[PDB]
């Protein structure tokens, strides 16, 4: 289920009330996260669970949840690179209902998109190194894209 802030705490625990806030009522067993818990570490743990409890049937969950897991590990270690948060956002948009074979992956990407929506500063604080995907090959001049 999506994370909610303390401003959403004054809200009845009904299906339509939580749904209109941008979440799901779910099993109505709420979990409270205090201030000293890092949001990136919490979502990293959640995505590790969701990416190892995938059944492996369909490509977006099977091959896109581990990519989000690796990105969140990099953001944990301060080894994130520019474009990682954009990759997480695109993964959240492309693992929604109907894109994947079952509803495991929408429920997987709900905490990620909610924590990006409400706690974006920590994910941006995870990015501390320039984007490098290649290595220089001696003899070949690279294509310096702008």
């Amino acid at each position: 289920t999506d994370f909610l802030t303390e401003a959403h705490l004054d809200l009845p625990m009904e299906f339509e009330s939580i749904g209109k806030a941008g979440s799901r009522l779910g099993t109505a067993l709420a979990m409270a996260v205090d201030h000293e818990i890092n949001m990136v570490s919490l979502v990293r743990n959640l995505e590790e669970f969701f990416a190892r409890e995938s059944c492996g049937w369909c490509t977006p969950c099977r091959d896109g949840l581990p990519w989000s897991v690796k990105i969140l590990r990099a953001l944990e270690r301060g080894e994130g690179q520019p474009g990682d948060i954009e990759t997480l956002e695109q993964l959240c948009r492309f693992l929604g209902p109907g894109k994947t074979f079952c509803a495991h992956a929408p429920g997987a990407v709900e905490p990620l998109q909610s924590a990006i929506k409400y706690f974006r500063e920590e994910f941006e604080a995870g990015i501390k190194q320039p984007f490098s995907n290649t290595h220089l090959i001696n003899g070949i001049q690279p294509n310096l894209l702008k």
Binding site: N138, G139, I140, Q141
Partner: protein, 168 residues
């Protein structure tokens, strides 16, 4: 007798007048060969070398054949570039695939186009071929020379590192 044939072949190899009958880009490279920056230094009747440098088209082939027949013995032929050797990149309906389909060729030059120093190297090769064979003194057994490929094999395979294309 032995020195006489050597002096005859020496005279033939140290005096060679080319009839540079070129037809295309290769001919323009040979035009650039005559300038003072390369230092390379008529009629088919008195010329002794025919340098076929360019594409041998199906319509230009009778001209090349006639101009080779107008020459007189001893006569030598150097093919320049991929077109004169094999037809080159023009495996097409209107191109004869190599000038050696209809006239014998003594020295072949790969390239498209060869640079003029390759033509000077082929002149050296033709001079060695002339000096090694022997012809009747008065009124033809060409020497089977070692190919340049196997002769130059050791110094070519021994090459390890080359300058990278990034710098100049």
């Amino acid at each position: 007798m032995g020195k006489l044939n050597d002096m005859v072949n020496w005279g033939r190899k140290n005096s060679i007048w080319p009839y540079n009958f070129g037809l295309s880009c290769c001919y323009v490279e040979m035009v650039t060969s005559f300038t003072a920056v390369h230092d390379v230094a008529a009629s088919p009747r008195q010329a002794d070398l025919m340098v076929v440098a360019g594409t041998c088209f199906t319509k230009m082939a009778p001209v090349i054949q006639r101009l080779y027949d107008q020459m007189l013995e001893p006569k030598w032929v150097i093919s320049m570039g991929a077109c004169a050797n094999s037809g080159g990149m023009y495996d097409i309906y209107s191109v004869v695939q190599g000038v050696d389909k209809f006239i014998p060729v003594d020295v072949y030059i790969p390239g498209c186009p060869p640079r003029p120093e390759a033509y000077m190297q082929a002149l050296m090769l033709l001079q060695e071929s002339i000096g090694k064979e022997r012809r009747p003194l008065s009124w033809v057994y060409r020497a089977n020379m070692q190919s340049e490929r196997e002769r130059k094999r050791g110094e070519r395979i021994a090459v390890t590192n080359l300058r990278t294309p990034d710098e100049i």
